[PDB]
Amino acid sequence: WLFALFGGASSLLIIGLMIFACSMMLTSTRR
Amino acid sequence: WLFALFGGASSLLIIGLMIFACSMMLTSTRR
Amino acid sequence: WLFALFGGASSLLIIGLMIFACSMMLTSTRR
Amino acid sequence: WLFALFGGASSLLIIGLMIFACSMMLTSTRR
Amino acid sequence: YEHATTVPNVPQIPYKALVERAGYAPLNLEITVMSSEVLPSTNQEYITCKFTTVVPSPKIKCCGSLECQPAAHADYTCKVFGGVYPFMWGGAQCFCDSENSQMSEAYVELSADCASDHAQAIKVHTAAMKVGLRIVYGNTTSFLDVYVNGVTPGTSKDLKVIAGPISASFTPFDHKVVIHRGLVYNYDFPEYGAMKPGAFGDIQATSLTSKDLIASTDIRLLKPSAKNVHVPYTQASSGFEMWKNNSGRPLQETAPFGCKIAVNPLRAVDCSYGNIPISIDIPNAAFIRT
Amino acid sequence: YEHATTVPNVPQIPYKALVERAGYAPLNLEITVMSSEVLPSTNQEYITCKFTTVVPSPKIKCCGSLECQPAAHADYTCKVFGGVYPFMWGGAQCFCDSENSQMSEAYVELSADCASDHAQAIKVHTAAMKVGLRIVYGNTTSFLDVYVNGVTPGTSKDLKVIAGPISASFTPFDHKVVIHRGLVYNYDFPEYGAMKPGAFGDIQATSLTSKDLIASTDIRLLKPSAKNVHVPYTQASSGFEMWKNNSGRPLQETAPFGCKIAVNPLRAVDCSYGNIPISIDIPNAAFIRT
Amino acid sequence: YEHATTVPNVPQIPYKALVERAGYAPLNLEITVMSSEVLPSTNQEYITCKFTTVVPSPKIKCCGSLECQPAAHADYTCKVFGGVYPFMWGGAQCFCDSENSQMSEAYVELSADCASDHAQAIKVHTAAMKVGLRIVYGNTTSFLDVYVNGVTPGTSKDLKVIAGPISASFTPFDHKVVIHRGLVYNYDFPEYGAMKPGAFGDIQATSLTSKDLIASTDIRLLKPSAKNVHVPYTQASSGFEMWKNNSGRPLQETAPFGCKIAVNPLRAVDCSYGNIPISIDIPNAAFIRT
Amino acid sequence: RLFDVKNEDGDVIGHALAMEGKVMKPLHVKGTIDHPVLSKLKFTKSSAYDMEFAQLPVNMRSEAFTYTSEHPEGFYNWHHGAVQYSGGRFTIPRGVGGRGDSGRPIMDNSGRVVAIVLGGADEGTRTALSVVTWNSKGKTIKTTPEGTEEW
Amino acid sequence: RLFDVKNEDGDVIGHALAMEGKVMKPLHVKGTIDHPVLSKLKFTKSSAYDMEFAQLPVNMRSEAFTYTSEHPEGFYNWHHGAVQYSGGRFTIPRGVGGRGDSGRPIMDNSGRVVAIVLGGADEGTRTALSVVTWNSKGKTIKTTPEGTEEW
Amino acid sequence: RLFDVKNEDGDVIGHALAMEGKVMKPLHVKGTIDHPVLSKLKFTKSSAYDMEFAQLPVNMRSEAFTYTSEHPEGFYNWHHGAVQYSGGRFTIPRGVGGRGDSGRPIMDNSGRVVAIVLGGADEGTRTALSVVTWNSKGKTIKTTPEGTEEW
Amino acid sequence: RLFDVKNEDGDVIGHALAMEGKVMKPLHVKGTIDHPVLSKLKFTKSSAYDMEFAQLPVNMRSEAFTYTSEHPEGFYNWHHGAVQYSGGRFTIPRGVGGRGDSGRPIMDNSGRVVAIVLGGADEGTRTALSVVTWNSKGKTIKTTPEGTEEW
Amino acid sequence: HPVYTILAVASATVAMMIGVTVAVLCACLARRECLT
Amino acid sequence: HPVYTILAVASATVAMMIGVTVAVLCACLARRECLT
Amino acid sequence: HPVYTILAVASATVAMMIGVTVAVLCACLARRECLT
Amino acid sequence: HPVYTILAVASATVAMMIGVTVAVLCACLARRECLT
Amino acid sequence: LVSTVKCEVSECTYSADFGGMATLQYVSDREGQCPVHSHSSTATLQESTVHVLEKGAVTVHFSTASPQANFIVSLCGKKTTCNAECKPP
Amino acid sequence: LVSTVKCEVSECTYSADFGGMATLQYVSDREGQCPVHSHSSTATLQESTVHVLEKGAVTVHFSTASPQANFIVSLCGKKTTCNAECKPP
Amino acid sequence: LVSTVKCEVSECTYSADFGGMATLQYVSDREGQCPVHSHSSTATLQESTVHVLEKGAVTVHFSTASPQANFIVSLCGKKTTCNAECKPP
């Protein structure tokens, strides 16, 4: 399970960073 | 004979139209 | 191990003080 | 020997003409 | 209750189903198949072997006309010749120059050796599966052979069982197969009366016994050359012997899914294919020890 | 004086050295080699031929236990069997059902034909060179065989001569070589006791005579099938006969530097390789006619 | 499984390997070497001892010419003298003033004592290592001698074992060694026929027996002084006795790595050098108690 | 300190301004700056403000316009006349400003720039301007009246 | 209160100033202070500000220049004329300041020092000065325009 | 309404004319029309008349020349003076027209175009012109005197 | 008879001269001759003399400059003033000649060319010129003072 | 046939192209150099 | 495993590239179109 | 040990010297080029 | 021979080419940068 | 009756047809013959029953390939979940 | 079966060829002859087996020089890690 | 003693192992068996000696490949140089 959560945590970086980039670029343009 | 006269009639179009074009462009310039 | 960590801790003083001097002289010039 | 001196005389043409060209172009510029 | 399960078609693999329901203490039903057997229903189309040629004595007739009549015999041939034996020196010791006619004829009979060794052209039909299955639950170490079809029921320990249709319909046997004792060959033999010369099936008879025989050897009568009365012919070698060479792919060799092949009932043993949907109807009594 | 020279290792090539020194009229010393001979020092490692299998009579014993003891013999095999001959009909005419035991055994002996024809596995060692050399100067038409090494001296016409070490160390013979009478084969035979089944060296004996033999034929005892008491076995064909086929590259065929190959002393004749540093110590007397 | 290990070459040191793998309970294989033995393969080059001089009777001949012919003998010397015994008073009781000739000759034979005590010049070759190794695992207290080379296999407890090549190739023995019964001396003796005067090897014979002997004592014939017919000579003392003094470094003395030295098989015992790469092929059966 | 922005036909469709160290022009004005140097500079868009800017060459930085965020209610001026600033809005008379006027500055009585005109909203009686300004901290602001047409 | 800094040839290449208790000169001016006492003092470098300083002898501390950080926009003066201070920058006319002028003070209308000239940046129309100033807390500041040449 | 046609050396070798909705020039005049727009138009040859034409851009169609086929005997005018029209021929004084004059219009007293000059024929006393005209129906006509040299 | 040689920016970096049947310019002056004809001629380098020449078109050969090798000590003239010729050298006042002056002729009192300026050597008090001249036989000569800078 | 079918249509498409191009371009030029 | 190790790192390098490229380029553009 | 005791103290005296010299000189220069 | 015949003529054509090209181009440049 | 019951595995092998050693443990009363099973999806065990009368723990044997899977194993009626690391054969 | 098993050392000596006294401890069932080993790299012990039938703890003997090293010592199949201070001989 | 001695060659062949015919010529006194050689580098001749007692000239045989090489050939002590054109075999 640890090899499927540490390896499954790096794939969540594109679902984590792109969201932390899209939630920071849509809030700075709308305010 | 009909396939050599209907197919031999389309080749006479360049000897028919170019003549009907050359006999209409030489008569309109000379009159 | 204690004689290799207390004697290996004094050699980390040039990697500790020079960093605490370089991180304090580069931040005061850039701000 | 004659085939090594008549054939070895044509290779001396680049060591004969280039010298008769370099000794005629360096003397006419320096005088 | 009415339990339903599926189990892979694999021999010697212990199977366990855990049925736990309602107030009843759970129950473990274990059943593993002892051995399958795919037996195609076959119909002997015909039989073939090498033949024996029979050539009757020639019928020579000086200065007279012969005429052969049609005959029932297999590959029966006959032909009246003329100008056969010119004179007495002609070989016939006949008078007339050419008026002489000779009746020639011949036919094919199944060789003698045939009953001993031969081959059978069969028609493999929608096969059915047997099954050695051994069911158990509580106390029922007993084994029971059954048909693996959607229908056939079977009761064990007061429980109805149906090993439903095999998950698939696959067989190592094609529509037409041939057996030359001990080896089964998928093959496409010619139909009865179809027989071709110098090839398998040149002669065919429904049974080893059957008085009737169909043969097409390309037996051809020849003209006699004046010299000695005789009856020559041209024929094609036995199609059977030829076949002995081009037997080819034996089913016994190819293993698919572990199938084994046996000639006597002509079946495939213990193939490992598909799953057998088990279905039961257990009584509340079975659930014993509730 | 102390003259020094070198001459190519080439047969039949006249060599001339001109020694002129000091007050003395010059002198011409001519010496040409008649024939070299590279003879490697070899050591017979072992011998191989085809073998003969020896299988003793079986020892059947009804309702009793046999037990074979180890034996000195080559590739000696033995095995006590049981349940061998079930009953009297068993083939033994024994009582007990399976209590019967049978001792089987067999071994390998060098074939009879071996002394006649066989092969020898040898070890080619640091070879030495002979030499037919013919020296001359003034009057000394005489020829003299000598060793071509840095050491061996030799006097002719009161002159010391040393044909120094050959300019190089090359030989047509590898570390291990094999000879099957008349043909030498560079080869890598297995070591003694190394022998492999169904291959060259399956049986090996130090000498054609040597009472001892090492064999590894993969001779394997088999179980008797009830029917008739006997002792079956499985073995691998002679490694020797097999070798007869894969003899391969004979040295006799490959010419390198003109070397010739002869089996009796096992050498290479007249190879043309390297130069022979001649060295002499001539007396002032030799310089005669000063 | 195929386990692989290495163990130091040290006697009496218990070795333990712990093999634990897969589902199997771990296994402890312990094997410690009982005693190594480095035995170099040697080849007796020759033998040496003190010699005995043999001087035949002189051949005096008044007023006549003698002439010695060459002889096969070892260090054979001969010389015809002249002007030997001037007159009758000359010692010869000869007539002629100087016409008289005397044949002198002498040679060297191996001393009598030689067979008793002598020395052997040998050639130490690529040595091999024995081994007393005692393997154990589960139940196999058994010991087994084996060769420590990359090849030699050996089965114990149904397990193949190979004590691979010794981690290094070191030996207390040089290329040439000499043994004077009981003591081995690394040494560089002269080659056969190489023998030098007044030094070890002055006389050399391949075997104690061998009828042939090569000797170079610097035996020199002398001229007789008129007075009494005799044959004088000059020779160099035995090279052998001289050697007795300069024997020098015995291998028995130098200990390297604890090596012991024994003359009969001529080997080095229990040297402690390198590691022996053990390699096994254990069956799943061995893993017993899984 | 003001330069023409020309279309392909050479006509003036807007203006660029040298102010506070840079050249700046309204982004919606698509043309070429009528100047040999400034036309060769690469501009950085500030889209949210309809502006585009580039650093002024060293020689132009000298007399570039000075900007001030302090501009209380009252009367200002631009190229076409008086400009009124009241209730946070800059207004001019109707029918005075139009095509080509985007980029022009609104000036105060001391020659300082108070705003940049982007366009305007004809409100029948007066024309309200769409302008770019900056606050005390120097933050860009874009004010646009409803009905604004980008000149 | 201003002293010449001379090169080996005696030429004036810069100036030193007596202000707020010390002698100070731009570090880039490599020469000797034209004074018997001040030339014998050991200076302490303040490299980040291109300055070098020493404590003034007791007798010079009296009338040393007074420095003020309060210097609003407007016109100041230095040796060569009027100096304008606007938008945080001190500018002078082009072609007025040059070699030897480093070290000179910028003065206000009360005789107080407002900045120290280090050099300047010829911006075609005007010359922008590189200067050393101090804030209210007395912290050193060095402002340098692009194109600055240390006189 | 008249534009220069220049050679590669920039010299005027003829003229183009804006008349009746199009730009037109004599075909024998091989050069570039001295105009940013008209030089980029693709011309259609009317070879029998030594003319080449293109449609005028919308802005030029306004004041393009007006042509009239009504031109009775009398005196007309062109760039170089009076032109006489008699016996179906337009004549000018000898030594007046030449290189570069092809493309020029002959005008009447009302500012309308009566003909286009292609060249002329020096007839010793007077120079007879080769001209392009149009009849009442708007049909092109090219009249060329013997001895005509295409300017 | 003198033409500008322009750089890509149009600035005058030197001169070409029509003299004795040809156009000639200093080779080190890398630019375009400001003339429709002369710019299309292929020049032949005379590198040892820092000159480049081409034959003058027929129309320019008429009033091309005349050269004279006879020019005794005294005062001559060029575009920037009096030129002194003494001790085999042409000198002018310091700070008078510079960039762009290469190619200019030195003239005598009769309108004839006496030398061609290639550059000069500031010798503190006077500026010595690097010049191209010709002797009586018409042989090219290039005289260059030490310290010469090719303008 | 494939030689007669390709050769006929070869000068057929070229017949109605060159024939109509010369008949339309010349008719257009005749109507343009006349209406003008 | 070689299918799970390659697929994970496939969207891992692309995760920290596209994730950081969009996080830096947008952060730079946000800081550039704001500071200007 | 004499190799480990000398090498450690070699970069120990030099650690507290260069480390404190750079930490004091830079701290003094930071306090001097700021207070002035 | 084919190695000696090709190598000789290799530096023979190149001898009379580079030798005459440098002797004519330099002679022409010497006569051109002198006659001018 | 069996109470609490805990499963402690020992071996695991991918090899089809049994491997590994599961061993249940419990406390019970009166004791009789207890049945055994595996309610999970896959993961079986060759053993229908085991008997408790001794008043001790039980031992069992099972199959399954999976690198590491869990399965619920009943003991008469009690239950539990088992799991463990695996290894190839 | 042996469970938990803990290792308590007693003596340690650098001297090559055995010293020190390791003593394992455990609880087991049924008991038989248990094997012994040392899975570690070095650190061995002269004792291949020991027997548990008594239902008590075990004692053992070992070797090794190291001033203080740890090693895993199995007991039939169970395991553990041992370690202790040392002293010169 | 031999005086003047001149060498006149006849044949020459590249073929290794002798060819060509060298023939020396001289005038001598008393005459005895004269030796022969070749002091040069290469170019040898199979003939160590020749005899002059007849009071005539000598003949010899030689080897060498070279297309045309010279070599010094002594006759007892006198010397000379030989050379000639060659031909392939």
CB contact under 8 A, H58 and I126: no
G241 interfacial to chain F (CB closer than 8 Å): no
**Distance between B13 CA and the closest CA of chain L, angstroms:** 6
Going by DSSP bridges, is the β-strand pair E27-32/E51-54 parallel, antiparallel, or unpaired? unpaired
Q: Do chains I and H touch (3 or more CB pairs under 8 A)?
A: yes
CA–CA distance, N13 with N6 (Å, rounded to integer) = 11
CA dihedral F244, F250, F252, F257 (to 10 degrees): 180
Strands (E), chain R: 2-8, 23-28, 33-35, 49-51, 71-72, 81-82
- Domain shared by I147 and I107, yes or no: yes
| Residue closest to F276 by CA, chosen among F19, F27, F40, F11 | F11
| Residue closest to H114 by CA, chosen among H140, H146, H76, H80 | H76
- Closest residue in R to F135 (Cα) is R48
Residue K121, SS3 per DSSP: strand
Give the H or E element holding residue O30: helix O2-35
**Distance between M15 CA and the closest CA of chain A, angstroms:** 4
Tokens, residue E30: 């274990």
Half-sphere exposure of N16 (CA within 13 A, CB side): 7
CB contact under 8 A, G26 and Q44: no
| Residue closest to R83 by CA, chosen among R4, R3, R10 | R10
CA–CA distance, H63 with I130 (Å, rounded to integer) = 18
Tokens, residue M24: 């830096």
Q: What is the DSSP string of chain F?
A: ---B--EES-TT----EEE--TTSPPEEEEEE-S--EEEEE----EEE--EEEE----EEETTS---PPP--STT-EEEEEES-S-SGGGTT--SSSS--EEEEEEEEEE-GGGTTS-EEEEE-EEEEE----EEESSS---B-----SSS---EETTEEEEE---S----S--SEEEESSS-EEE--PPPTTT--TTSTTSEEBSSSS-S--EE----EE-PPPTTS----EE----HHHHHHHT----TTT--GGG-EEETTTTEEES---SEE-EEEE--TTTT---
CA–CA distance, Q63 with Q17 (Å, rounded to integer) = 6
Residue for token digits 């050599």?
Answer: B4
Last residue of a domain, one of J45, J65, J85: J65
- Beta sheet of G27-32, edge-to-edge order: G17-19, G27-32, G134-136
K53 interfacial to chain O (CB closer than 8 Å): yes
Residue G161, SS3 per DSSP: strand
For residue F152, the chain G residues in CB contact (below 8 A) are 193
- Contact indicator for I38, I15 with CB cutoff of 8 Å: no
CB contact under 8 A, I138 and N34: no
| Residue closest to E110 by CA, chosen among E72, E69, E73 | E73
**Distance between F123 CA and the closest CA of chain R, angstroms:** 38
CA dihedral J2, J6, J11, J16 (to 10 degrees): -20
Distance of CA F168 to the CA centre of its chain: 24
Per the structure, the complete domain to which residue J13 belongs is given by: 1-65
- Closest residue in J to L29 (Cα) is J46
- Our count of domains for chain K comes to 2
What phi and psi, each to the nearest 5 degrees, are found at residue F39? -115, 110
CA dihedral G263, G265, G271, G273 (to 10 degrees): 130
Chains in contact with G, counting 3 or more C-beta pairs less than 8 Å apart as contact:
F, P, Q
I136: region left, alpha or beta (phi > 0 left; psi from -120 to 50 alpha): alpha
**Distance between M1 CA and the closest CA of chain H, angstroms:** 49
| Residue closest to R60 by CA, chosen among R27, R28, R82 | R82
Choose, out of R37, R45, R63, the residue to mutate when testing the contact with F (most F CBs < 10 Å).
Answer: R37
For residue E136, the chain P residues in CB contact (below 8 A) are 48
Q: Which residue among the candidates H28, H35, H71, H80 is catalytic per the annotation?
A: H28
CA angle J127–J129–J132, rounded 5-degree value: 175
CA dihedral F193, F198, F199, F203 (to 10 degrees): 40
Q: What is the DSSP string of chain I?
A: -EEEEE-TTS-EEEEEEEETTEEEEETT--SEESSTTGGGSPPEEEGGGTEEEEEPPGGGSTTPBPB-S---SEEEEETTEEEEEETTEEEEETTS--TT-TT-EEE-TTS-EEEEEEEEEE-SSEEEEEEEEE-TT--EEEE--TT-B--
For residue N22, the chain C residues in CB contact (below 8 A) are 17-18, 21-22
Residue N33, SS3 per DSSP: helix
- Contact indicator for F146, F156 with CB cutoff of 8 Å: no
CATH class as words, domain P1-82: mainly beta
**Distance between M33 CA and the closest CA of chain H, angstroms:** 5
Going by DSSP bridges, is the β-strand pair F155-156/F159-163 parallel, antiparallel, or unpaired? antiparallel
Q: Which residue among the candidates K4, K15, K101, K102 is catalytic per the annotation?
A: K102
**Residues 132-161 in E contacting P (C-alpha not used; CB under 8 Å):** 136
- Contact indicator for J17, J24 with CB cutoff of 8 Å: yes
Q: What is the DSSP string of chain E?
A: ---B--EES-TT----EEE--TTSPPEEEEEE-S--EEEEE----EEE--EEEE----EEETTS---PPP--STT-EEEEEES-S-SGGGTT--SSSS--EEEEEEEEEE-GGGTTS-EEEEE-EEEEE----EEESSS---B-----SSS---EETTEEEEE---S----S--SEEEESSS-EEE--PPPTTT--TTSTTSEEBSSSS-S--EE----EE-PPPTTS----EE----HHHHHHHT----TTT--GGG-EEETTTTEEES---SEE-EEEE--TTTT---
- Domain shared by K71 and K131, yes or no: yes
Residue for token digits 């029979």?
Answer: E54
CA–CA distance, Q40 with Q73 (Å, rounded to integer) = 8
The structural domains of chain M, with segments of one domain joined by +, span 1-36
State the first-to-last Cα distance of chain M, in angstroms, to the nearest integer: 51
Tokens, residue R35: 């030796």
Q: Which residue among the candidates H4, H50, H101, H108 is catalytic per the annotation?
A: H50
CA–CA distance, M34 with M28 (Å, rounded to integer) = 10
Tokens, residue J68: 């009239």
DSSP K97: -
Handedness of CA G98, G99, G100, G104 (dihedral sign): positive
CATH class as words, domain R1-83: mainly beta
Here the CATH number for the domain that contains residue K122 is 2.40.10.10
Q: Amino acid identity of J19? A: M
- Contact indicator for F275, F9 with CB cutoff of 8 Å: yes
Q: Count Cβ atoms below 10 Å from residue Q32 Cβ, excluding itself.
A: 9
CA–CA distance, P58 with P53 (Å, rounded to integer) = 11
Q: Count Cβ atoms below 10 Å from residue I38 Cβ, excluding itself.
A: 20
CA–CA distance, K78 with K104 (Å, rounded to integer) = 7
Using CA atoms, how far residue C11 sits from E8, F167, N4, N26, in Å, is 69, 64, 12, 21
Residue H121, SS3 per DSSP: strand
- Domain shared by H40 and H102, yes or no: no
Using CA atoms, how far residue G15 sits from G12, N24, Q21, Q78, in Å, is 9, 61, 19, 22
For residue M32, the chain H residues in CB contact (below 8 A) are 44
For residue C28, the chain N residues in CB contact (below 8 A) are 30
- Contact indicator for Q82, Q9 with CB cutoff of 8 Å: yes
CB contact under 8 A, M33 and H48: yes
- Contact indicator for K130, K143 with CB cutoff of 8 Å: yes
What phi and psi, each to the nearest 5 degrees, are found at residue J139? -80, 135
For the question of residue H46 being annotated catalytic, the response is no
Tokens, residue I137: 């807390």
CB contact under 8 A, O12 and D11: yes
| Residue closest to F73 by CA, chosen among F99, F89, F54, F57 | F54
Helices A17-25 and M2-35, axial angle in degrees (round to 10) = 20
Half-sphere exposure of J54 (CA within 13 A, CB side): 17
Tokens, residue E65: 């006309």
| Residue closest to B17 by CA, chosen among L15, O3, F125 | L15
Last residue of a domain, one of I21, I49, I65: I65
- Closest residue in H to I86 (Cα) is H66
| Residue closest to H21 by CA, chosen among H60, H50, H74 | H60
Distance of CA E104 to the CA centre of its chain: 37
Give the H or E element holding residue H105: strand H105-107
Spatial CB neighbours of F169, under 8 Å, sequence gap ≥ 6: none
CB contact under 8 A, O36 and K47: no
Chains in contact with N, counting 3 or more C-beta pairs less than 8 Å apart as contact:
C, I
Tokens, residue K78: 């060029």
- Contact indicator for N30, C25 with CB cutoff of 8 Å: yes
Which option is the CATH number for Q1-84: 2.102.10.10, 3.30.70.20, 3.40.50.10130, 2.60.40.350? 2.60.40.350
CA–CA distance, G123 with G179 (Å, rounded to integer) = 11
Q: How many Cβ contacts (< 8 angstroms) between chains H and M?
A: 10
Give the H or E element holding residue N13: helix N2-35
CA–CA distance, E109 with E72 (Å, rounded to integer) = 12
CA–CA distance, F31 with H38 (Å, rounded to integer) = 100
Q: Do chains E and P touch (3 or more CB pairs under 8 A)?
A: yes
Tokens, residue P72: 């619920």
Q: How many Cβ contacts (< 8 angstroms) between chains H and I?
A: 21
Chains in contact with F, counting 3 or more C-beta pairs less than 8 Å apart as contact:
G, R
Q: Do chains E and Q touch (3 or more CB pairs under 8 A)?
A: no
For the question of residue K102 being annotated catalytic, the response is yes
For residue I121, the chain H residues in CB contact (below 8 A) are 58
- Contact indicator for G201, G119 with CB cutoff of 8 Å: no
- Of F151, F191, F194, which is closest to G194 when you measure between CB atoms? F151
Q: How was this structure determined?
A: cryo-EM
Distance of CA F163 to the CA centre of its chain: 29
DSSP P35: E
Going by DSSP bridges, is the β-strand pair I140-143/I126-134 parallel, antiparallel, or unpaired? antiparallel
Please tell me the CATH superfamily of domain F7-35+127-165+252-281, with its number. Tick-borne Encephalitis virus Glycoprotein, domain 1 (2.60.98.10)
CA–CA distance, K108 with O12 (Å, rounded to integer) = 58
CB contact under 8 A, B17 and L15: yes
Residue J119, SS3 per DSSP: strand
Residue P78, SS3 per DSSP: strand
CA–CA distance, F250 with R47 (Å, rounded to integer) = 41
Last residue of a domain, one of K65, K92, K110: K65
CA–CA distance, F232 with D3 (Å, rounded to integer) = 88
| Residue closest to G155 by CA, chosen among G282, G66, G40 | G282
Which option is the CATH number for E1-49+115-202+238-290: 3.40.1670.10, 1.20.120.80, 3.40.50.880, 2.60.98.10? 2.60.98.10
N36 interfacial to chain I (CB closer than 8 Å): yes
Residue K147, SS3 per DSSP: coil
Helices C17-25 and N2-35, axial angle in degrees (round to 10) = 20
- Domain shared by H60 and H73, yes or no: no
Spatial CB neighbours of N24, under 8 Å, sequence gap ≥ 6: none
For residue K48, the chain O residues in CB contact (below 8 A) are 33
CB contact under 8 A, A17 and M23: yes
CB contact under 8 A, A8 and M8: yes
Distance of CA I15 to the CA centre of its chain: 8
Tokens, residue B27: 């008569």
- Domain shared by H85 and H131, yes or no: yes
- Domain shared by K54 and K90, yes or no: no
Spatial CB neighbours of J112, under 8 Å, sequence gap ≥ 6: J65, J66, J67, J68
Which segments of chain F belong to CATH 2.60.98.10?
7-35+127-165+252-281
CB contact under 8 A, O32 and K47: no
Burial of H58 (0-12, 13-18, 19+ CB in 10 A): middle
| Residue closest to I1 by CA, chosen among I112, I142, I131, I132 | I112
**Distance between D3 CA and the closest CA of chain O, angstroms:** 10
CA–CA distance, I5 with I54 (Å, rounded to integer) = 15
CA–CA distance, H116 with H134 (Å, rounded to integer) = 10
- Contact indicator for K46, K23 with CB cutoff of 8 Å: no
Residue for token digits 């090596």?
Answer: G259
CB contact under 8 A, P48 and E136: yes
